[PDB]
Subunit: 272 residues, 4 copies
């Protein structure tokens, strides 16, 4: 009888998933409808809808479930992050990449993902903020389907960078990452020992001299390159560089990056 | 374009062969696929469906009820008195489901759900008896596991022996009828007890109700009448049948009235026809 | 603290004997000061108050109506049939305002508003006649006056048709030839105390009151005297009224009700703001 | 033929110069007369106006705030990040009320309420500094009278710090005593000491001040004609410096400041502005 979630919202991207909407809904809705006696299901129609729905329902609902890929999850992130009241968020993975779902240990089988939600295991998750843009997975320069990070990793120029991190300063670089999530491009993060709930972000720079070392590092796929953890980060380049992040964005250097500890609460899989 | 921007589905979890998860697998996905704004509320107690209808009537364009006669009756009593009444649809989740049958709704719950997505809607008359609303019927003289009140009565009418008589005064559209009776029905719906109405030529959307009385003396005549399955007006002393819009029914002593579901209604009764008071999802392939 | 977390004020803009702005200057500020969640809706057409009551019944803890007998009746018909019925209060905005007077509400609208902020609440009986609810009265034989049905009747009674009536009340019967048949719930009729004696709106019972065909002159003198003490008069909970031919019934506002009638009482069906000083 | 089917009035009960009842007698009746669907919510705590704006943004067409600079700032921070942002109006209930003055709103609260009923609306720019939004200003080197009001009252009787300002692909490095980025046309209850600032021109005004004495004389002899206009600004200091803005905030350098052109629509007074 003792649920955490009196009212639930399921946001459905109809274009998400393998094919039939009906088939996808046959897999994900019945378990949710059985478990949650007040369930509201809204389809998105256009880019931005998920963001709008999150903003409208944030104060009316206790759990928001998003069925969609990285892009839809990012819309939800941007929708809830700036709000004072932020209900618990859950992901049913409906893209091909689904990075943050994997960080939470969510099964890629959508029926199982739905079933998981009904178990109501919830944990705090850190949300990053770069010049007012929020992100869950990563921030990166030098990355530029499978997605931006996925394509970069499947197929893996110099510029100077000045990074100010928690009172300390840091060269000529090829790749600069700030990681929050534990998976990137559908596989465990190539940035070592990243945690999404440890109150800190992981800076990761591949140097000018380290191009070959980095190629081998990604291949061997066993991690433990300049790498440091930090809460408050400022990243500067010689000229304005376009930044890549969880989804479509207009962000560019220079950047103040800041970590919001436990900003979201999210459904996760404690078995994994 | 859809007629229904926002939809509410009220689920009685006890409804159906009972298995919630299985039932929801059958009914929800087609609805969720068709209707991009769908709200699903489970009832917990008697009266919840009525409350939900009353809270959502002004917020929603379609209300779907998954339940048996009792839950449908709760919805009837919820929406009927309101000024704004969205369209109502039934997924039949009991064993009887009289009004669903009147609307030609398939008893296969998946197919009932699919029907709703076709959005065929018609006006339906709602009767009002002393402020109680009903869709199927009003009756006196109907009174171990239940086919429903009317269904059980029809199954045992043949082998039930000594029925009690009572006097009745019926005022119908400025005419009066007074006699000793065993059964008095006022029918709105076209099915009673799971089969076509024994009251002849009843229509739920013709702007009028059907009065149907068996005299104290007409027990045998009525048994034969049902067996004959010839639902027409026998020019029969024992059976009185007339159509009327505005009806008042009086008995010597207060008698408990039977209707679509659980109710506290009793005689005397003002019964009133509200023409096209509801709009409801129906099956034009059958009705 | 407060009984009322959320409040709705329904304003009939045509109500009051002064413009909208002046009326709102008198009634809104005290309410806004007292109630930190206040929603104000103006009616535009007949029926709106009914609709607003039905939409907000489940969202709000108090509903205040600023209007005359007609607007109050729209609220009565809006809330009465619902399962959830918040507390109702009246700011008197007509000329008659019968039920506001029953509750002891001052006719000064600023004072009526102030009263609501004191949050004195009592159960009130609501009558039900063939599914029509009423707060004040039900009557037959009441046949450009803005004084209201009863008010106009009382003003012109000085200078009628008889009809037979059969009244069944709580297992007793009364038949006779009559000129006026009233069933009273409220304590004021036509802007003055009820001519039916000792009527109470919260005593769990209704007052039947019949003026016989022989008592026309006696009744005219009785009204002139304005004595209003204990014509056939009895209290009853469950009443059935029959006439020879269908007669049109008069009640709180516009209605299509007619005899024969089952009249029934719903004890404490509403809770309402009242004035315990009066 | 109204622009506003549904209206929300957010009241700070502590706002205004006398009793709440008196204040409500002045502001509510004109609004209630003009707007047939009016919802009035009192704040109880810091943050409530922000929460109310966020809850009602999608339910309402106009949000009126009765309060000072701090309450207005709560509304700014409430609406600015949202996708759907109804029109905002100010009834000035503090002593400073800078942005209300930018919009030409009379300081007489009854007249401010009446203005709203005329429904004159214009786009207004909102600035964004590291995800904090502001309407009036951003600054380093600044009872109270408010941050700017107190600063101006005590300026008669300071520290220097290095600053790097990147503005629309140009750079400015120097040692400074005061750095302002202005959006609003009034600061500290009087016209902006930053010259020719406009809240709706699509651009922000950078204003930096060796110039301690020159600045003291400038404020005294209020002539008002390093100062430049820019849309996209980055401000860096040697060490993290606390930033001052419209109300209470945790903002600090370094800062990306961005202008969002016509981000809000707001009730204004075309007889004055
Ligand atoms: Mg981490
Ligand atoms: Mg019919
Ligand atoms: Mg009484
Ligand atoms: Mg400007």
């Amino acid at each position: 009888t003792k649920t955490k979630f009196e009212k639930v919202l399921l946001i459905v991207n109809p274009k998400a998933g393998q094919g039939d909407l009906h088939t996808n809904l046959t897999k994900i809705v019945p378990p949710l409808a059985a478990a949650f006696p007040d369930l509201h299901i809204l389809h998105t129609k256009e880019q931005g809808d998920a963001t709008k729905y999150c903003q409208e329902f944030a104060s009316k609902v206790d759990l928001i479930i998003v069925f969609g890929g990285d892009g839809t999850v990012f819309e939800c992130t941007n929708g809830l992050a700036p709000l004072e009241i932020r209900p618990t968020l859950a992901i049913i993975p409906g893209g091909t990449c689904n990075d943050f779902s994997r960080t939470l240990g969510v099964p890629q089988n959508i029926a199982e993902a739905a079933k998981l939600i009904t178990k109501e295991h919830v944990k705090p998750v850190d949300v990053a903020k770069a010049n007012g843009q929020h992100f869950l997975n990563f921030w990166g320069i030098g990355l530029v389907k499978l997605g931006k990070i996925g394509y970069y990793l499947s197929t893996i120029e110099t510029f100077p960078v000045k990074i100010t991190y928690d009172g300390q300063v840091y060269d000529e670089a090829v790749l600069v990452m700030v990681g929050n999530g534990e998976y990137l491009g559908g596989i465990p993060s190539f940035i070592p020992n990243v945690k999404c709930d440890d109150g800190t972000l992981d800076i990761f720079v591949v140097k000018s001299t380290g191009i070959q070392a980095f190629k081998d590092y990604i291949g061997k796929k066993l991690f433990e390159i300049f790498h440091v953890k930090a809460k408050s980060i400022h990243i500067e380049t010689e000229e304005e560089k376009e930044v890549d992040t969880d989804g479509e964005s207009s962000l560019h250097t220079p950047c103040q990056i800041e970590l919001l500890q436990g900003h979201f609460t999210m459904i996760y899989n404690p078995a994994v």
